[PDB]
C-alpha cells in the first residue's frame, strides 16, 4: 500500500501554465490539488490521517510555496537551457511503510514524457535517459542546500508518518471487499469467446478460460478498467473453432469459492 504523490505541470507558452496534483494510497486516490483552488482537497474522510489541523496546515503551506516556486524554476531553466515550449513536466514521489522494516522512498521527475532526474540519498541525480546538457540543471538544483534538506525530511521523516496515520484511519476501507458480477458473451469474429467480470475491489484478480480442471494458456486477458465506484471491470477472451468449455474467476470477495461459467 504505497503512497503515490503525482504532479502534472504543463507550460503552453512562457505566458500560460497549469499545475495539478493528486495522492494515491495504493489503488485509491486520496487527495487532489487543483491549480485554481488554494487548499488541497481531501477525497476521503480519513484523508488527513492522524495529522492535526495544525500539522496539516503547515504541510499545505509548504506545497503552496512549492507549486509556485517550482513553476518559475522551470520557466527559468527554459530560458537558461534554451528549451522550447510547450512543455510537460511530471513528478511522482512518495514512500511505502513496511511494518517489519524501515520504509523506502522515491522522488522521480520526467520531462516531455521521459525520466530525467530523481532524488536519491542527499542530492539530485540524472537518469540514464537524460542528455548531457541536463547536468547543468542538476548542478543548479544541487547548489540549493535548504531544498535538498527539506526534500529528505519529507521522504524519510514526513511521508512515512503521514502514511501510518492513513493506514490506521483508513484500515477499515482498504479491507473492504466487493463481489464482482460475471457473465459470458459471443463477441467479435476472428469465433472468439468473452468472459466479463465487473464491480470488484481490491484490484488483484484471476480470470482464465479452461475446458477442464486443468486450465490452458492462450487466454487473452484484457485490461483492468475502473468505475466511478473505484470498482473494476475485466474481459478475458479466447479464440477457437470445439464448443464446450468454462470460465473461472478467483478473488478475495468470493472467499474460498471461485466462480465458474460454461459454454
Amino acid at each position, epitope marked *: 500500500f504505497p503512497l503515490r504523490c503525482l504532479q502534472i505541470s504543463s507550460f503552453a507558452n512562457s505566458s500560460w501554465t497549469r499545475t495539478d496534483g493528486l495522492a494515491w494510497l495504493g489503488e485509491l486516490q486520496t487527495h487532489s490539488w487543483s491549480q485554481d483552488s488554494d487548499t488541497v482537497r481531501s477525497l476521503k474522510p480519513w484523508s488527513q490521517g492522524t495529522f492535526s489541523d495544525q500539522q496539516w496546515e503547515t504541510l499545505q503551506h509548504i506545497f503552496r510555496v512549492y507549486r509556485s516556486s517550482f513553476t518559475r524554476d522551470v520557466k*527559468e*531553466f527554459a*530560458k*537558461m537551457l534554451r528549451l522550447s515550449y510547450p512543455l510537460e513536466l511530471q513528478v511522482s514521489a512518495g514512500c511505502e511503510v513496511h511494518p517489519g522494516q524501515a520504509s523506502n522512498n522515491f522522488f522521480h521527475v520526467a520531462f516531455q514524457g521521459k525520466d530525467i532526474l530523481s532524488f536519491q540519498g542527499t542530492s539530485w541525480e540524472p537518469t540514464q535517459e537524460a542528455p548531457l546538457w541536463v547536468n547543468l540543471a542538476i548542478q*543548479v*538544483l544541487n*547548489q*540549493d*542546500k*535548504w531544498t535538498r534538506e527539506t526534500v529528505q525530511w519529507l521522504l524519510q521523516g514526513t511521508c512515512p508518518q503521514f502514511v501510518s496515520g492513513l493506514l490506521e484511519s483508513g484500515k477499515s476501507e482498504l479491507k473492504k471487499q466487493v463481489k464482482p458480477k460475471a457473465w459470458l458473451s459471443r463477441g467479435p469474429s476472428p469465433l472468439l469467446l468473452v468472459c466479463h467480470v465487473s464491480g470488484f475491489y481490491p484490484k488483484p484478480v484471476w480470470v482464465k478460460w479452461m475446458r477442464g480442471e486443468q486450465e490452458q494458456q492462450g487466454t487473452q486477458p484484457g485490461d483492468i478498467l475502473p468505475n466511478a465506484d473505484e470498482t473494476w471491470y475485466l474481459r478475458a477472451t479466447l479464440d477457437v473453432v470445439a464448443a464446450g468449455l468454462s470460465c473461472r474467476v478467483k478473488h478475495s470477495s468470493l472467499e474460498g469459492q471461485d466462480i465458474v461459467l460454461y459454454w
Partner: T-cell receptor, first 113, second 116 residues
Framework: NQVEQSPQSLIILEGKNCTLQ??????????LRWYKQDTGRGPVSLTI?????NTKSNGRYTATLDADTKQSSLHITASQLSDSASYIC?????????????FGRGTQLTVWP | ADIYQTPRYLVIGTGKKITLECSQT?????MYWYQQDPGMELHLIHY???????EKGLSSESTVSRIRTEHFPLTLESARPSHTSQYLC????????????????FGPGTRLLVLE
C-alpha cells in the same frame, strides 16, 4: 512590496551610533544583502547573509539576521560623514543563480559633523 | 570597482538610437541591467546568465545583446522621454561553487536625459 525598511530617513551627529531596520515577507528565503549607495553613484555591497548566519561584520558595519521573524538590522558604529547615503536591503528567494531579487525603497542616512 | 560604464552622462533628442556600454574585467557569468528613477528603487530591466543569454526583467523598449562575456551593451532603437533615468549595470559572482551566492558588483551608472 515584499521588502519594507525603517526608518525612512534619519540624521545623526558623527561619532554616534545608529541601527537600520529591514522586514521582509519574501518566500522562500535564501539570503539577505545590505547595499550602501552614495549620492549619484553605484550601489555598493556591504554584507551578504545566508539564513545559516546571524552575523556578518564589515568594518564599522555589523549586520544581524533573524530568519524566524523575517527581519534584519544593520548597526553602524562611530558614524562618520562618509556614511551619509542610501542603505538598501536586498533579499533573494533562491540559493542559486535561479533567484529573483527584491530591493527595498532604502533608508536615507545623513551624518552631520 | 572592476566593472565599467560609458558614458556617465548623455543628453539626446527623441528618436535617436542609443546604446549604453558595459564591461567587466571579472569573469562573472551573470549580469543585470537596472533602471533607477530618482528617489525610486532599483528596477530590473535585463539579466544574463552568460554569453548568448539575454532575458527581459518591467517591460522596456530596450534590448540587451550578449555576444561576449565581458560585454553587456544595452540598446534603445528609438529614444523617448519616458526612458529618462539612471541606468546601472551589475554582475554577480553567482553560480559555480561557493558557500554563498556571489555578491553583486555595480557600475558608476549612466544618467541619460531625453528631450523633444
Amino acid at each position: 512590496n515584499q521588502v519594507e525598511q525603517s526608518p525612512q530617513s534619519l540624521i545623526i551627529l558623527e561619532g554616534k551610533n545608529c541601527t537600520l531596520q529591514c522586514n521582509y515577507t519574501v518566500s522562500p528565503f535564501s539570503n539577505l544583502r545590505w547595499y550602501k549607495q552614495d549620492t549619484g553613484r553605484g550601489p555598493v555591497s556591504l554584507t551578504i547573509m545566508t539564513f545559516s548566519e546571524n552575523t556578518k561584520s564589515n568594518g564599522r558595519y555589523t549586520a544581524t539576521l533573524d530568519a524566524d521573524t523575517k527581519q534584519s538590522s544593520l548597526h553602524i558604529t562611530a558614524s562618520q560623514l562618509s556614511d551619509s547615503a542610501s542603505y538598501i536591503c536586498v533579499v533573494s528567494d533562491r540559493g542559486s543563480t535561479l533567484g529573483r531579487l527584491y530591493f527595498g525603497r532604502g533608508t536615507q542616512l545623513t551624518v552631520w559633523p | 570597482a572592476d566593472i565599467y560604464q560609458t558614458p556617465r552622462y548623455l543628453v539626446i533628442g527623441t528618436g535617436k538610437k542609443i546604446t549604453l556600454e558595459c564591461s567587466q574585467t571579472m569573469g562573472h557569468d551573470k549580469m543585470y541591467w537596472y533602471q533607477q528613477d530618482p528617489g525610486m528603487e532599483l528596477h530590473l530591466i535585463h539579466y544574463s546568465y552568460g554569453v548568448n543569454s539575454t532575458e527581459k526583467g518591467l517591460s522596456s523598449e530596450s534590448t540587451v545583446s550578449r555576444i561576449r562575456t565581458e560585454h553587456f551593451p544595452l540598446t534603445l532603437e528609438s529614444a523617448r522621454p519616458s526612458h529618462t533615468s539612471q541606468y546601472l549595470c551589475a554582475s554577480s559572482e553567482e553560480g559555480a561553487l561557493k558557500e554563498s551566492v556571489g555578491t553583486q558588483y555595480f557600475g558608476p551608472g549612466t544618467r541619460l536625459l531625453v528631450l523633444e
